[PDB]
Amino acid sequence: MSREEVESLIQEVLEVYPEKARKDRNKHLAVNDPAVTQSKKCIISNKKSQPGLMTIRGCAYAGSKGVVWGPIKDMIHISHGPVGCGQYSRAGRRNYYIGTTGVNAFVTMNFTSDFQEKDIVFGGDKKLAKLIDEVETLFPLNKGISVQSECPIGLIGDDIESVSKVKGAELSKTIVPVRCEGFRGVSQSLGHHIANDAVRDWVLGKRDEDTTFASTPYDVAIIGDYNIGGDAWSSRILLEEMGLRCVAQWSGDGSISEIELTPKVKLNLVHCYRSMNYISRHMEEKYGIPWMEYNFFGPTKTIESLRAIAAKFDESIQKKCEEVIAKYKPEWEAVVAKYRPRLEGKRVMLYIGGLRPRHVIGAYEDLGMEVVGTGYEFAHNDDYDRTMKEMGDSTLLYDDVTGYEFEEFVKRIKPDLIGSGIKEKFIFQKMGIPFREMHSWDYSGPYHGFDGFAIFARDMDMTLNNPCWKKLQAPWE
Amino acid sequence: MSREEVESLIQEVLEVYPEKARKDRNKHLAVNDPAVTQSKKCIISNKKSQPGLMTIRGCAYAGSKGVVWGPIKDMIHISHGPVGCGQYSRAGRRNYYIGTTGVNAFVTMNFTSDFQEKDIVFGGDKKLAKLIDEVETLFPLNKGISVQSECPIGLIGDDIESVSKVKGAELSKTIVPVRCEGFRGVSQSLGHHIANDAVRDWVLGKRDEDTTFASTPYDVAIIGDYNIGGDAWSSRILLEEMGLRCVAQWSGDGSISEIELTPKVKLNLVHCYRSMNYISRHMEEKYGIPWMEYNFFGPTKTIESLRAIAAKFDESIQKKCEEVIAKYKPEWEAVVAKYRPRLEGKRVMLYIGGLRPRHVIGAYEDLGMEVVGTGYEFAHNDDYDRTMKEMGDSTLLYDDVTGYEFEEFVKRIKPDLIGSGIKEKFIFQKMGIPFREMHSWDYSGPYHGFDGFAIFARDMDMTLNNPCWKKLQAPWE
Amino acid sequence: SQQVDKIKASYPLFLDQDYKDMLAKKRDGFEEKYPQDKIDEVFQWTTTKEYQELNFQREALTVNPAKACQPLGAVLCALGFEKTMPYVHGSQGCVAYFRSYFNRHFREPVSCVSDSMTEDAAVFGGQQNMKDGLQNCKATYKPDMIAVSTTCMAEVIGDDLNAFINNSKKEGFIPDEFPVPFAHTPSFVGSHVTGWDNMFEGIARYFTLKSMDDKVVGSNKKINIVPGFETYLGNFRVIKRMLSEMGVGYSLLSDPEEVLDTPADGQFRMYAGGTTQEEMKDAPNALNTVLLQPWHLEKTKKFVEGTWKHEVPKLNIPMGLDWTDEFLMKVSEISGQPIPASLTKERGRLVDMMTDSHTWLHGKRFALWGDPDFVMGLVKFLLELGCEPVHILCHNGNKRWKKAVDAILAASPYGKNATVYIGKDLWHLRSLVFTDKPDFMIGNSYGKFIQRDTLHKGKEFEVPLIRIGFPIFDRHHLHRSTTLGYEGAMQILTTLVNSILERLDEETRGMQATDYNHDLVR
Amino acid sequence: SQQVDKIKASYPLFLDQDYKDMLAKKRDGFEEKYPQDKIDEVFQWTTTKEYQELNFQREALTVNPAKACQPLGAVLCALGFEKTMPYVHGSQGCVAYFRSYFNRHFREPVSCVSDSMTEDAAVFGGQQNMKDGLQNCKATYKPDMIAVSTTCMAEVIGDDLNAFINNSKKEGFIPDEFPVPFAHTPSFVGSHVTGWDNMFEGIARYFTLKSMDDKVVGSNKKINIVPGFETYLGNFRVIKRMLSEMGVGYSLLSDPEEVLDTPADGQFRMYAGGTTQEEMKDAPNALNTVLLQPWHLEKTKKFVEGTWKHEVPKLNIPMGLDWTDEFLMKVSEISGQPIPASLTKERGRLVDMMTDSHTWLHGKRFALWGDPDFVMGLVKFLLELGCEPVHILCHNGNKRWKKAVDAILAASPYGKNATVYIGKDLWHLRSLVFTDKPDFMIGNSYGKFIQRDTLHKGKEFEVPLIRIGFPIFDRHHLHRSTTLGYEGAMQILTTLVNSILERLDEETRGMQATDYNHDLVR
Ligand code: ICS
Ligand code: CLF
Ligand code: CLF
Numbered sequence A, B: 001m002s003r004e005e006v007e008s009l010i011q012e013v014l015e016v017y018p019e020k021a022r023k024d025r026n027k028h029l030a031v032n033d034p035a036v037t038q039s040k041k042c043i044i045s046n047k048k049s050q051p052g053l054m055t056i057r058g059c060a061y062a063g064s065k066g067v068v069w070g071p072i073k074d075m076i077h078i079s080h081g082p083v084g085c086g087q088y089s090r091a092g093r094r095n096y097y098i099g100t101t102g103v104n105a106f107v108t109m110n111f112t113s114d115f116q117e118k119d120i121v122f123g124g125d126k127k128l129a130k131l132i133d134e135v136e137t138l139f140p141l142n143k144g145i146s147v148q149s150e151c152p153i154g155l156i157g158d159d160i161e162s163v164s165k166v167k168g169a170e171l172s173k174t175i176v177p178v179r180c181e182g183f184r185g186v187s188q189s190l191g192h193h194i195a196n197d198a199v200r201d202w203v204l205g206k207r208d209e210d211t212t213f214a215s216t217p218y219d220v221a222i223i224g225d226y227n228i229g230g231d232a233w234s235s236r237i238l239l240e241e242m243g244l245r246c247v248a249q250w251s252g253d254g255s256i257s258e259i260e261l262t263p264k265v266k267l268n269l270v271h272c273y274r275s276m277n278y279i280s281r282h283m284e285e286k287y288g289i290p291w292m293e294y295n296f297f298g299p300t301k302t303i304e305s306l307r308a309i310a311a312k313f314d315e316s317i318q319k320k321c322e323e324v325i326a327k328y329k330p331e332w333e334a335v336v337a338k339y340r341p342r343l344e345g346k347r348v349m350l351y352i353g354g355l356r357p358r359h360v361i362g363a364y365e366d367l368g369m370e371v372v373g374t375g376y377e378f379a380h381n382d383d384y385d386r387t388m389k390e391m392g393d394s395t396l397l398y399d400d401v402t403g404y405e406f407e408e409f410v411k412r413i414k415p416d417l418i419g420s421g422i423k424e425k426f427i428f429q430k431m432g433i434p435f436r437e438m439h440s441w442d443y444s445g446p447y448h449g450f451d452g453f454a455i456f457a458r459d460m461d462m463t464l465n466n467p468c469w470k471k472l473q474a475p476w477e
Numbered sequence C, D: 001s002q003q004v005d006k007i008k009a010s011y012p013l014f015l016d017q018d019y020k021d022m023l024a025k026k027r028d029g030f031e032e033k034y035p036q037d038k039i040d041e042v043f044q045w046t047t048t049k050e051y052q053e054l055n056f057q058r059e060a061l062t063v064n065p066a067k068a069c070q071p072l073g074a075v076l077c078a079l080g081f082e083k084t085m086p087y088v089h090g091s092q093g094c095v096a097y098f099r100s101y102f103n104r105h106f107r108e109p110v111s112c113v114s115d116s117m118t119e120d121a122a123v124f125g126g127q128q129n130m131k132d133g134l135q136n137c138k139a140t141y142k143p144d145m146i147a148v149s150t151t152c153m154a155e156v157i158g159d160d161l162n163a164f165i166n167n168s169k170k171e172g173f174i175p176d177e178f179p180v181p182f183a184h185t186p187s188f189v190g191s192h193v194t195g196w197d198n199m200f201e202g203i204a205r206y207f208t209l210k211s212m213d214d215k216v217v218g219s220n221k222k223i224n225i226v227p228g229f230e231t232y233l234g235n236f237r238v239i240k241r242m243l244s245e246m247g248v249g250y251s252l253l254s255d256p257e258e259v260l261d262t263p264a265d266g267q268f269r270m271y272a273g274g275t276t277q278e279e280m281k282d283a284p285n286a287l288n289t290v291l292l293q294p295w296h297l298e299k300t301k302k303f304v305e306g307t308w309k310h311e312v313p314k315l316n317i318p319m320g321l322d323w324t325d326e327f328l329m330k331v332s333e334i335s336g337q338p339i340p341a342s343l344t345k346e347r348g349r350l351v352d353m354m355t356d357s358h359t360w361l362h363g364k365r366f367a368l369w370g371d372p373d374f375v376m377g378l379v380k381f382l383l384e385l386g387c388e389p390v391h392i393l394c395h396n397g398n399k400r401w402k403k404a405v406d407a408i409l410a411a412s413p414y415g416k417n418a419t420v421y422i423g424k425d426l427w428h429l430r431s432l433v434f435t436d437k438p439d440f441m442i443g444n445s446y447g448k449f450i451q452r453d454t455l456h457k458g459k460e461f462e463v464p465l466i467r468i469g470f471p472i473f474d475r476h477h478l479h480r481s482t483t484l485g486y487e488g489a490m491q492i493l494t495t496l497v498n499s500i501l502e503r504l505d506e507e508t509r510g511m512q513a514t515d516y517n518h519d520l521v522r
């Protein structure tokens, strides 16, 4: 398809809308041009959703509890409000961890204040205070409590900050208030922000006066890898084989102690810029700790990123970097030799949240596949900036894509593979298009590092070339 | 019903037969009398089955392979002939054992010469001989081999005896030929006899000239407990707490060595007269070893048999007998206190093989129940002798009962419970009559000794009083 | 490391020596973890009678709920009408979760829209969201009807749905006669089954309240069937099948079976099947209305009795043997059609199965949970089988329901060891299966984590999960099953006996130790 | 000892310390058992490649067969006809075993008689038994037809079935007109499936050979369906249901589904349902005859083509997707009825489940066995699912069959690690699952012993059994399942994917070891 056919497709799709939504949606749909290297010049992002168009977006609570806070394994997180939010988000996200659940770790459990009508009327602050005490009795090895606000908390005028301060002092315990009510902002994105501000104000400082931690020149932190299917452990093994010491890793398989030790490190390695740039900037200004983005998705990006990381230290680390590279070279070369022939020339459309739509492009390229359309749920313009340069000319870009748009684009572009979320999966499968989940990894993974690339290639292959796709037409039709 | 009502029942049932089958079956059905004992005063047995009437009876291979030889655990038993016999009898009978199956024990395996048409034409002897070498190679820890003849072996003139001697000497191994072809005799019974003679002729005498076995005044053998559901182990424990040493126990959980040590004991305790009396009389004749029958079915019988066994020895065994009786007293009285109220008054009809139809009466009586009919597949007149004094006046007796007869008797007598075999079970369940399998114990047991009585009672209760029985009639009928 | 020819996913990959050592250093260096001895000691304590007492003293904290919120059920109710778009007035985050909660249970697309209320609507109300939302929805996905429910944001701010929808029509955003039934569905009242009831009652009102004058009870010669919140496709099917076998004219009100089970044949179908608007308008002309799950269909019953004048019969959910009998006999009496030979035979086939499996079922002890109607049906069937339901937990149950279950229990000797718990959660149930250990759990996927904890204490303490309920996320296609009727009873019996036999096989598989009882025939 | 309130059966009773010690003393005292070190060492050896070579060298010894003998199949075939008593001329022992074997699988009565031939008849022939037997059977159990097969004794001595039956009629033991079809069913040729074939052909010949002159192909507008040896009730039901949905007239020749699934309603029915004699007489008037399991219906085929002149079409067993499609398409061509909307949809539902479950099914390795038509259909479906059938075993299969299966394997990349074995037994299969380990076995209850052996080597070596086939004795009511058609493919898929996920659950249940991958959602 040519530029003119895409642009034509865009206006064709907008026809169905009433004028108000039409005009807004036009601004969120663009064709990429390598001639303009500046996000705004092409597309608009991080605006309100148009009502009733079937956006794929979640809320600020999903961004704060589901994404940033929930993975922290040795704290108890309370879904404070009515029963729904905590239930639907119980163990739906694969932020993997090591611990003894119900005893020292609490990730896949659902703790809630389960609001009734009386708590709407009189407020829930007295119930929150009692809940905190019941939690200390029943879960004595918890090392901290967060309070994740659902929609009604802010709307009835509760003061969870006051309950948290008074109860924190009484019990000599960290209780973190989080105002991540789902009506706040436009998407999961503001939830990230509020949750980073909460880490900052209530946890990250706890050890500013302590000098006992013995440091080394090679201390780093892995910030914003949520360890989907083990993703962070496959990234971590490579940093440790390269001679760095990973003092902290959060929030996937993250402990509160390692959040509190993060200000001790020499470099913050940031996997997800969108969710964690707020805290990373705060740490540079307050502690003089630099940060850098990196990508361990596919061998090309992994290799480039190891080199860039190594480059921030001395010769000895750069040496180990080249040894790690030589070690895994045969393994990834074999994955390529086996799977690239089976995937070469096939065309992929992506739709994910705030990072993966650009971050996974390199891995597809290492298998000789072409990303012909990508898009984000809740990215900002600095994200679209990095995207336009990683995507080919005349590719489609879509922001806060509606159900209708995504289905009509696909019908016309006819990609060979789609990578999106659970809400999209069963749609395109029915239309005969191979589909892979690019949040949950379809219950597979890891996809990070050299070990994850293997898994990643097997998965794309098993699905794209599955014999089920030849069977959708009954032979008598 | 009075005697007369049963008498006329037998006549009504017989009217359907043609004359020849009518006259025969009259002789196999009778009513029990208050004075007249000696069987041949009132019923005939151990005759041919009338063709086409659906006898429940099996064959001489069943009696020999499935019953006597099959349970012997450290030997390999060959179903010699075509494929069916060994397949249908593979692990149908729960003769429990301790061992490592396929390595040093082989009970639930099916070894066969799987006759093809070439073996009918040329005979099976060369195949048999090759088959034995293959067994020695593949199962080197077998301690002997038996050859269980199926129907065609005798009919085509094979000489298994000669193969067995020649290969026996060539390989220094015990190889037992058994002529238990299914066309011999009229039932499982002849299979018992043939199997006992083969034991006599080929195994029992192996240690006649050996004197190394260190004997005691208290050595016994348990003969003809096949350990169904562990029956034999529940009897054994009682004999040993009484201070006896059970040197041999066969066939259930029986090893070939224990068979060979049986001539060294002081007393043969025979569970099943019908199947093992032949070898029992031969051992008294040849070695001077006495035998007695015993019954550990229900507390009444168990107590009386423990006393009778103890009486054959000195005062120290008699004292231990009383300690065993006193120890188990509270246990079995608690089974009675609990289940007798739930079973008191209920009426039972039985049909089984050669022993249990009379042997289980006492246990039912211990639970307040009444046996209003019993009969045997393949009993002899001495079995019926012992049976008439155990059954009430005016009860029904049936030998080689036909499918028609059993159904019709039951319709008219309306017992509360039937205890029979798998071929009978689902017929009576459909007629809304609670049914317990009294060969297999319905996958339960043991039913022997005091521990067995607990299970037997639970089992009659769970089935007799089950809520399902009230539900057969749809409420709109 | 990977061997390219035998690639390892997370399991068993992180069991490789190099990962295990790396994981150990993470923990020892920087996680400041409680010692293993203390972890073990606290675990043991959480299994005790002492801890169960503290646990059942909770008033403020809920741990691991066995319920969801109203609007989830409203959506599922709305999914059951012809070409209908469920539409939740409020915040969009709720909608993403509703859809993905159902996607994972049915392995199917789920269509639902929000009108994306934000902080601005928090101040000024959601009026504009409704107007633009309805117009955008109608034009974009071309539904024949939009069924409006609410999230808790919109309940708290007090948005007037009726006015908001009327204004939307008055100002020309959707056509005047375009159907927009609505219901208030507050997440802080009752539960998801309550949302199902509120939505249904709002839809029945929309199509019938103002056209009542020409209606005559019985003039269409049909019986209305309201299924309630239902996530087994077989339960819809079996009810239709049985009524078709009796030759009973009927009308299933809210029927999502088609839209939740479309073919993968090359096209995506947003809408399929479902109760037509004509069937909802004509529903008052039926002989009567039968509620399949009455303990969550109370508001619907008040409406049907008060406005339609149907004498809704006192029938329990048709689960197990006696209550499928009663259901068929009531339908026979209402319709004047006899129960036919086919269903009499199907019944006796169920009883045959009960006769064949009663020895293994007898005295087997169960903990179980779910919605009120489903739980009482399961309890009832367990008693009919000779099983003992020892822990019966219904988080969204009420005191009147519990009294009805206690009466059911008292009428059978098999109920003597049973206790009913309402308002309790799966952390309460965890204690129960440690201190008064049953043989199995019957429940949804959340129970796999209770089975894990039991096994951590030791193999002898493990209580296996049998998956019956909603949601089931960790097996595939069980949502096709049936729990109602004779068919459903047959499927449950089979599943229960084979779970017991499977477990006995596991316990008897040790060679020369336990395999004396490893029987070929059971 | 027993505690009266908590009674123990054999498991776990004999684990009590006093029983253990007793068992120890028995062993050490008098069993003269090989030491435990030697047992371990021989076990290890039986799992090796060395032992496997020896095992596959056997010529004379068969161990743990996966087949039975002809007359078993003759009996099942006969039970499929209206008020028909099966009758096996020869020894009664055979008959006690046929009935038990089937009782235990179907958990139902199974009616069959012998004429009880003994040593007398070995020498003078069974003529007298046959005369008395036919007269006694007719009078006592009042069948409308008696169908005669033979045990190996009657074959070896050359009893003339034909003459014996004629004389019984001549000499007035049963009426001339009374139906008594017969077949020679020697146990020393083929297997149970061969007996089904022989018996069916004998029944078809009886009713049609002498009356061909008034017959016109097509005149009755039906298709004959011959199921072959079939022990899932769901497979008779699905075939009927699909043809009824198509509006195709058909005649199921041998239909035992009613007599093997009677109601438990207070009476025993010896006979129920079954193909009528009028249907067998009229069968030559059909358009054609379809054989559902052609690889054991060769003799039946030749009769049908040679005498009835139907052009029996070349169709595989309708299992899995392509072959169910091909079956339906062929039936449409012959009948002139279009494939209807309902079945098109059902197909697409199957395809949807395939798309939903492909990720867990992909690459999974299976050892399997059974009868030849069932085995090849399971093989086909497995390839369609993206599974790898590595050990394919058919003890009663032949060279020609093997070649066709090899060709099915070569048409798919998923076939490349597959080997087909014929004439081999479950002891051969045991070696295979040690030396080239699959993930699962698909087979009958005899496989449980192979699973046991594998676990004994170690947990990592265990190969779990998935029970599909015959006989199944150690689970309840699985005989009601379906394996043909789309319905059957739906059941097999669900079972296969859930067995995979259940195993993954078991491997990931260890807390703080493997539970990182114990996902709620799969
Ligand atoms: S051996 Fe006999 S038929 Fe005495 S052939 Fe039979 S395990 Fe029966 S009544 Mo099955 S003479 Fe044993 C018997 Fe009794 S197989 Fe068992 S139950 S006590
Ligand atoms: S945007 Fe708000 S914080 Fe986000 S997910 Fe929605 S409530 Fe929660 Fe919860 S209980 Fe249910 S799902 Fe809601 S309607 Fe109230
Ligand atoms: S009385 Fe004879 S020894 Fe007894 S069980 Fe019958 S054959 Fe066997 Fe075997 S193979 Fe089959 S089952 Fe037979 S017809 Fe031949």
Ligand SMILES: [Fe+3]
Pocket: A426, C106, C107, C108, D352, D353, D356
């Ligand atoms: Fe689906």
Ligand SMILES: [Fe+3]
Pocket: B426, C352, C353, C356, D106, D107, D108
């Ligand atoms: Fe049955």
